[PDB]
């Protein structure tokens, strides 16, 4: 049950590497 | 024991006076602008 | 870098880096075993849960014979 | 068109009525105690 | 600089020190196993398997060693309660001994791979910069696993070239290590039938050998390599963990 | 000297003090030091207290067999009821520690100070030119301590029925409360948990939405936090991107775009909910308890058809029937 | 089409003044005709126990459960 | 022995130290009772 | 032995409190 | 004996606690022997059973 | 290719965003909500718990509920067409099929929803910390409505879906597991309670630390939906708390991350505690306490007191709360104090 | 009283070890030039 | 956008519809229940 | 062989595919009608 959280964390951090560190422009 | 009562009483009076005579001292005045 | 005996012998195995198949490659074929596995699990699951009984398969301590 | 403020006060009373019917049902229904 | 909880990212793309790291971990896990063993052997009482069996003595590792064959001590006693038996070298002491050494070696290995981190094997000929062809790796590893999975069921559990596994009657009164014959029938999917544990490893082993080859040959459809950000090791992780916790919720249930 | 007292008042009220000792502070600082100092000593070394007035001392201090989780400062005796029991009311300290004197010295000074603490949360805001009302948010948690430490006892007729000062002692207050008032079945408690659950919920919503929509200004290997400098002019997150995401999760009009309306809601919810929870305990302090649906649904013959409400009553009876073993001499529990 | 406009369109009400009460009277009848009781095996005020019995029709075994339930309805329960 | 180029420095500010210790200590105040059981 | 352990940790948290309030990193602007 | 032993709630994994450390023996103790089957009866000879 | 066309359609920006995730979310989420609302008003819990549980029987919004299946069912998934119900619907209802229905469906519904956040996040191009956060509620649902009863004798001991039907779940846990004394439950509450504080406290700090950007009293309109300057004095807030509490934030990025952490960590801990209550590996007693209480009859702590409250809860409840046990506790065996 | 023998050392190392960790860092951070 | 047309059988219509009709089919039953005597 | 519960399994395995079917049918269709 603890590892589930790791998966959700690392997975996310893989599909959003780009937006990691923050976002930017447009509206 | 009857003493302690006296002392305690004195002590609480001090502070309670310090408190009333405090806000009385024109407290509204104390602040950034309009006063 | 630093080549080494073992290093060279293994050099091939690790070199085709970004090499990808084109388009939807084997995807569809994969999506079938995937669906097959999904059904396979549901079966062994439902067997353990005694939801799917099968004479011959007795899901208890016994069966040891 | 139908003025909004009326759609509301009408749909409103309409709810106090049904929800109120429920409260009455509490001293008569099966959920009673009698 | 790096926040405390990120210090290990210093490896995200240093295949060398990543292996050096993974080597040290294996060393500690193997080391732990060896010594957790010795701890049980220094406190476990074999004087009575009937009313004071390993599971009454807070034994945790000792059972996993019996389930696969090791059931004796170099000191003479044995889990089933027999005497005069000769466990040979593979006694609880032996197993414990082995791991402690495998740990020492993995250690030394972790050291070497740390100092010689810049082996060429990790640099892509093309870009000349560090890179690991994951898709092919997975295929390779998966091949070896099924190859080993196969052997385990094929030779160990069957008795062909191994001990067997723990098998007992319906009321744990007779249990022991015995060779188990496969079982491809339907009742082999019954959790309580040993035959199923054999069949599984032989079949899954093969399927594992086949599938490995596939992945050693066929490349990942562009669509996927893109979707599942392959060629980005921090995704190999996200999927493995998902598998590791799946494996976990299952062992906890059985 | 521009005038000693004139000066004194300038210091007290000074906004240049590391800790703003205010006018309210002049009452706070002492009362809070007494409450705290007496507690710590009690909790560590006080001897057994005849909480139920039946000469059956309950020791709740560390040195007398308790650990952090069990230990507590026990409530004044029931023999004492609502009577004032200042140290100078006892033939000796030995007598004062036995009837649970420390409890009152603590609750009274604490409640006193914690109020001034509110009075202060106003004063400083004034001396600093900021809008008031923060102190009004703190009125909720305070209004609870009050309900649990004073209203309930006044209502019930004794300080011995106030919540004990300890971990387990609190669970006792709860378990028994439930039995005598069936609080879980009271509107006010429910509003309470909505506010608390909700709070934590929203606390997570805001927290994430914002943190997730921060403008990039940091390295790939640099704490994303550094991307903010104390004393910035413009904002540090895209509240328009935040709203953009959240509006799509549920649906646009069900999402905030006005940071001010967002933050009002953020404060309003928990504070309002806890206000009701505090009014619940202050209300059940006069025996207006939760809904009693015992034997409501009955069948065609008259038989009683149980509901979960009944399974709850059994669990309550167990508590009723076992709490205060030796304290009751009669049929009805009217105290 | 902006809800506001629709909730105000006389067409809307012309449609729903019919539809809404429609659905209502339907569900009402669902209960009032005793149909609901059979769709959900829910006991009528006179069907919890048999006249004398004061025991509960507790289902005691999974597989022959449905069968066991049927028998509970038997004792005029 | 080429100076490995993948290393960065590590940091822990004063506030983090405090937040850290506050956590360690209180957890200890929370679990010690069960350790001594 | 237990009492000592409980009081010690408590005494340590209060010490922390002190240092945190009076020995924080002065909060600097712009 | 072995068979009788499995029929003792003190070997039920569902009994126990999170901080009730150690082997099962620090609890009820090292099992030595089976006292035997206990049959309860009342004046009338009737055989009773313990829930 | 149709796929990208299927995609195109789904990811189209509507009033109620569908998305790939929706293909899982909406089917389930609606069925779960639906099944509840159905049972709440129509299905009974007589054949299951000997309890009236729906409006149709006389229950009100508090007493109604979708009760668990019999204990006989065990951990059976109870499928409409499984060995139990056998395709029959009404029977299914009477055997509590509606529980595993709501349970299992809602379960997938929480997966779909988190996926949604993940999918919508990606599209809108924002970080997924809204998804990380939602792991907390999943854990709770998973450990409590699934893992827990999976460790017990059957689904019967999982919390039944309903208001009151949940209060007994609480009382039970006190009485049988002495759950309030559990280190993990405590952390749980410290987080939820502490999280509902940050919420309230931060909100007020902002509303009363605002700059004047309008001439009205109702300062709500005075807000720039289009960023620019900070709408409240972060610098003033810092000084306020730094003088009234002694400690105060000064890095909105951290202040907001903290707000994610506190309540998500709390719920995670409360989960672990329950994952342990599944095996009954509870935090019931303190051995040193029990030993002294045995030898010495005058030793009394607020702890011993509580344990007695538990004995009463167990003895007086067990009978109608565990029907399958055909419990019969003679009046003389029932623990009770004097007079009461 | 009748407590656990390892309780003391379990609590001691539970506090020391991680505290010692943080401290090692903070001081090595704190002493980094410029 | 567009010479402001709009279709009758929209999309959201469904969402608000599967939660619509039922809501009434129940609040219509639930009321009729209040009249069930013992 | 093919026991009552085995038949039910198919009934559910079949009744399941159908739902996935009509769903992806309808979807794949309406998707290809505007974009
Ligand atoms: C993010 C998270 C997202 C989650 C999304 C989930 C999607 C769907 C989840 C479906 C889960 C269904 C679980 C199936 C199950 O419970 O099936 C359960 C069955 C077990 O059946 C049980 O068996 C018990 C005892 O049987 C055994 O003992 C009996 C006593 O005589 C008999 O001897 C019998 O022969 C013998 O088998 C009882 O009879 C119970 O009533 C009965 O339910 O098998 C099994 O568990 C199957 C083995 C599965 C193990 C998985 C465990 C994972 C975590 C566990 C945590 C535990 C704490
Ligand atoms: C299974 C393999 C696995 C691996 C290889 C990683 C690897 C990583 N994780 Mg990760 N994680 C995992 C599982 C895993 N995780 C699980 C199961 C969870 C859910 C709890 C998480 C939750 C998580 C978060 C929330 C974060 C990471 C982050 C990171 C990176 C951290 C840098 C670091 O090492 O901190 C160094 C760690 C320390 C100095 C102190 C840790 C002290 C405690 C936790 C453990 C003490 C050891 C314990 C006794 C050992 C037994 C462990 C048991 C599992 C066997 C790193 C790449 C961080 C990141 O990527 O930031 C950008 C980050 O924020 N992980
Ligand atoms: C992974 C599973 C695992 C399991 C199931 C066990 C199980 C067991 N062990 Mg082993 N053990 C393990 C790993 C494991 N061990 C490892 C890795 C080591 C080497 C370090 C040991 C070393 C060891 C020894 C030396 C002994 C045992 C013994 C025992 C038995 C003790 C009985 C007991 O009361 O447990 C007690 C269980 C606990 C206290 C677990 C509670 C953990 C809580 C307190 C804290 C979590 C902390 C965290 C800070 C919380 C919140 C953090 C916040 C940030 C969110 C038991 C069978 C004893 C034995 O064999 O007796 C015959 C014994 O003497 N074990
Ligand atoms: C959109 C997603 C969705 C999902 C994930 C589910 C999921 C589920 N529903 Mg559900 N349902 C849905 C939509 C959905 N539903 C809708 C729209 C309706 C209204 C029509 C229902 C109405 C409904 C009812 C009435 C019931 C369920 C039930 C269930 C559960 C059944 C267990 C089972 O056997 O699975 C079914 C699994 C499969 C069909 C496997 C799919 C396999 C695919 C990948 C390949 C097939 C290949 C080929 C044909 C196989 C042949 C192999 C050969 C060797 C023979 C399960 C949790 C039951 C329940 O809740 O019990 C407690 C129940 O009674 N559902
Ligand atoms: C010898 C003796 C006497 C011993 C003991 C005596 C005794 C009774 C001790 C009891 C203590 C005890 C044992 C407690 C047990 C509980 C405990 C230790 C649990 C520990 C484990 C646990 C809960 C772990 C994780 C869960 C978790 C995250 C909990 C978080 C709790 C928490 C810190 C909540 C926050 C509370 C709080 C005051 C936040 C303030 C935030 C901040 C200062 C606001 C100010 C502020 C607001 C703004 O809006 C802005 C903009 C700015 C800029 C700003 O500044
Ligand atoms: C379209 C989109 C919809 C989205 C969400 C809908 C959410 C609906 C919740 C509906 C609850 C209905 C309860 C009901 O109908 O009860 C009907 C019942 C039954 O009332 C009983 O009926 C019996 C006969 O069936 C007898 O007549 C009883 O005597 C009578 O008491 O409820 C009440 O009387 C309820 C008073 C309820 C006050 C509720 C406040 C609820 C707050 C909910 C969530 C807050 C957050
Ligand atoms: C095998 C053996 C293994 C042994 C393991 C050794 C133990 C390791 C111990 C780790 C210590 C962790 C502390 C580090 C500090 C830290 O994490 O902050 C450091 C991190 C990151 O902090 C960031 O650091 C960045 C650069 O490092 C920047 O400076 C950022 O500004 C800053 O925000 O912040 C957090 O961790 C957030 C966690 C929130 C803490 C909650 C406090 C808990 C209090 C709950 C309520 C208590 C009530 C008490 C009641 C009385
Ligand atoms: C049984 C009786 C029930 C009593 C319910 C009381 C509800 C009070 C709700 C107020 C929450 C307090 C949060 C503080 C938060 C805060 O500071 O923001 C307060 C906010 C007004 O902020 P303004 O910048 O507009 O104040 C300046 C002028 O508007 C004059 O007030 O209040 C409202 O929006 C009206 C709410 C009343 C409707 C109820
Ligand atoms: C939806 C909505 C809403 C709603 C509302 C409503 C629904 C309302 C209603 C209301 C109503 C419905 C009201 C009424 C009122 C009334 C009154 C105010 C009255 C008075 C009267 C009188 C005074 C009388 C007299 C008399 C008589 C009759 C007889 C006897 C004698 C005498 C003379 C006494 C709102 C807005 C919130 C908003 C949102 C939405
Ligand atoms: C406390 C605790 C825990 C944890 C734990 C752990 C994680 C542990 C680990 C442990 C470990 C991890 C261990 C290890 C060990 C190791 C060892 C013991 C090693 C050794 C080695 C050696 C001895 C070597 C040697 C050598 C060499 C190197 C070379 C060649 C030769 C020779 C052989 C001589 C838990 C969370 C569960 C819970 C609570 C409590
Ligand atoms: C189960 C199921 C199914 C179906 C069905 C469905 C899906 C249903 C739904 C249903 C629904 C969906 C229903 C609903 C209902 C509702 C109601 C009955 C409501 C009520 C309400 C009320 C009473 C309200 C009130 C209020 C509030 C809350 C707040 C404040 C204000 C007022 C007063 C307005 C199927 C075949 C698939 C399968 C099996 C299962
Ligand atoms: C649209 C969605 C439909 C979803 C499910 C439809 C299921 C129909 O399901 C099917 O019903 C028939 C009864 O009519 C059941 O039939 C079952 O009960 C009958 C007795 O009543 C038995 O004789 C039979 O041997 C047994 O299998 C099937 O076991 C069940 O699988
Ligand atoms: Mn502490 Ca309120 Mn149960 Mn009478 Mn005593
Ligand atoms: Ca009649």
mmCIF file of N, CA, C and O in Angstrom, chain E residues 37-57:
data_model
loop_
_atom_site.group_PDB
_atom_site.id
_atom_site.type_symbol
_atom_site.label_atom_id
_atom_site.label_comp_id
_atom_site.label_asym_id
_atom_site.label_seq_id
_atom_site.Cartn_x
_atom_site.Cartn_y
_atom_site.Cartn_z
ATOM 1 N N UNK E 37 19.669 -15.236 9.457
ATOM 2 C CA UNK E 37 19.688 -16.680 9.589
ATOM 3 C C UNK E 37 20.410 -17.038 10.870
ATOM 4 O O UNK E 37 19.819 -17.629 11.783
ATOM 5 N N UNK E 38 21.682 -16.670 10.939
ATOM 6 C CA UNK E 38 22.497 -16.957 12.108
ATOM 7 C C UNK E 38 21.804 -16.582 13.417
ATOM 8 O O UNK E 38 21.964 -17.260 14.432
ATOM 9 N N UNK E 39 21.041 -15.497 13.398
ATOM 10 C CA UNK E 39 20.331 -15.050 14.589
ATOM 11 C C UNK E 39 19.292 -16.087 14.984
ATOM 12 O O UNK E 39 19.101 -16.364 16.157
ATOM 13 N N UNK E 40 18.606 -16.654 14.002
ATOM 14 C CA UNK E 40 17.604 -17.652 14.309
ATOM 15 C C UNK E 40 18.288 -18.933 14.747
ATOM 16 O O UNK E 40 17.834 -19.598 15.672
ATOM 17 N N UNK E 41 19.395 -19.276 14.109
ATOM 18 C CA UNK E 41 20.082 -20.495 14.497
ATOM 19 C C UNK E 41 20.684 -20.397 15.879
ATOM 20 O O UNK E 41 20.884 -21.405 16.553
ATOM 21 N N UNK E 42 20.965 -19.186 16.319
ATOM 22 C CA UNK E 42 21.548 -19.020 17.638
ATOM 23 C C UNK E 42 20.485 -18.988 18.731
ATOM 24 O O UNK E 42 20.825 -18.996 19.914
ATOM 25 N N UNK E 43 19.208 -18.978 18.339
ATOM 26 C CA UNK E 43 18.114 -18.911 19.312
ATOM 27 C C UNK E 43 16.961 -19.903 19.130
ATOM 28 O O UNK E 43 16.119 -20.047 20.034
ATOM 29 N N UNK E 44 16.911 -20.570 17.974
ATOM 30 C CA UNK E 44 15.859 -21.543 17.676
ATOM 31 C C UNK E 44 16.100 -22.845 18.410
ATOM 32 O O UNK E 44 17.221 -23.334 18.426
ATOM 33 N N UNK E 45 15.045 -23.397 19.006
ATOM 34 C CA UNK E 45 15.116 -24.664 19.736
ATOM 35 C C UNK E 45 14.484 -25.835 18.981
ATOM 36 O O UNK E 45 13.268 -25.911 18.797
ATOM 37 N N UNK E 46 15.312 -26.782 18.539
ATOM 38 C CA UNK E 46 14.764 -27.926 17.812
ATOM 39 C C UNK E 46 14.248 -29.051 18.703
ATOM 40 O O UNK E 46 13.688 -30.024 18.213
ATOM 41 N N UNK E 47 14.418 -28.911 20.008
ATOM 42 C CA UNK E 47 14.009 -29.952 20.940
ATOM 43 C C UNK E 47 12.584 -30.496 20.783
ATOM 44 O O UNK E 47 12.287 -31.584 21.277
ATOM 45 N N UNK E 48 11.695 -29.768 20.114
ATOM 46 C CA UNK E 48 10.336 -30.281 19.952
ATOM 47 C C UNK E 48 9.527 -29.661 18.831
ATOM 48 O O UNK E 48 8.997 -28.555 18.960
ATOM 49 N N UNK E 49 9.392 -30.400 17.723
ATOM 50 C CA UNK E 49 8.666 -30.015 16.521
ATOM 51 C C UNK E 49 7.165 -30.163 16.657
ATOM 52 O O UNK E 49 6.410 -29.662 15.824
ATOM 53 N N UNK E 50 6.721 -30.861 17.692
ATOM 54 C CA UNK E 50 5.289 -31.049 17.887
ATOM 55 C C UNK E 50 4.648 -29.834 18.556
ATOM 56 O O UNK E 50 3.806 -29.165 17.956
ATOM 57 N N UNK E 51 5.047 -29.550 19.798
ATOM 58 C CA UNK E 51 4.479 -28.423 20.525
ATOM 59 C C UNK E 51 5.281 -27.129 20.541
ATOM 60 O O UNK E 51 4.776 -26.109 20.998
ATOM 61 N N UNK E 52 6.514 -27.160 20.056
ATOM 62 C CA UNK E 52 7.321 -25.954 20.033
ATOM 63 C C UNK E 52 8.055 -25.897 18.707
ATOM 64 O O UNK E 52 9.286 -26.015 18.649
ATOM 65 N N UNK E 53 7.304 -25.707 17.620
ATOM 66 C CA UNK E 53 7.853 -25.634 16.275
ATOM 67 C C UNK E 53 8.259 -24.204 15.944
ATOM 68 O O UNK E 53 7.744 -23.266 16.540
ATOM 69 N N UNK E 54 9.171 -24.047 14.990
ATOM 70 C CA UNK E 54 9.642 -22.741 14.562
ATOM 71 C C UNK E 54 8.627 -21.594 14.617
ATOM 72 O O UNK E 54 8.983 -20.504 15.030
ATOM 73 N N UNK E 55 7.378 -21.810 14.219
ATOM 74 C CA UNK E 55 6.426 -20.699 14.244
ATOM 75 C C UNK E 55 5.953 -20.246 15.632
ATOM 76 O O UNK E 55 5.190 -19.287 15.755
ATOM 77 N N UNK E 56 6.407 -20.917 16.684
ATOM 78 C CA UNK E 56 6.037 -20.516 18.041
ATOM 79 C C UNK E 56 7.185 -19.691 18.594
ATOM 80 O O UNK E 56 7.020 -18.930 19.539
ATOM 81 N N UNK E 57 8.349 -19.850 17.971
ATOM 82 C CA UNK E 57 9.579 -19.177 18.369
ATOM 83 C C UNK E 57 9.911 -17.922 17.572
ATOM 84 O O UNK E 57 11.074 -17.547 17.461
#
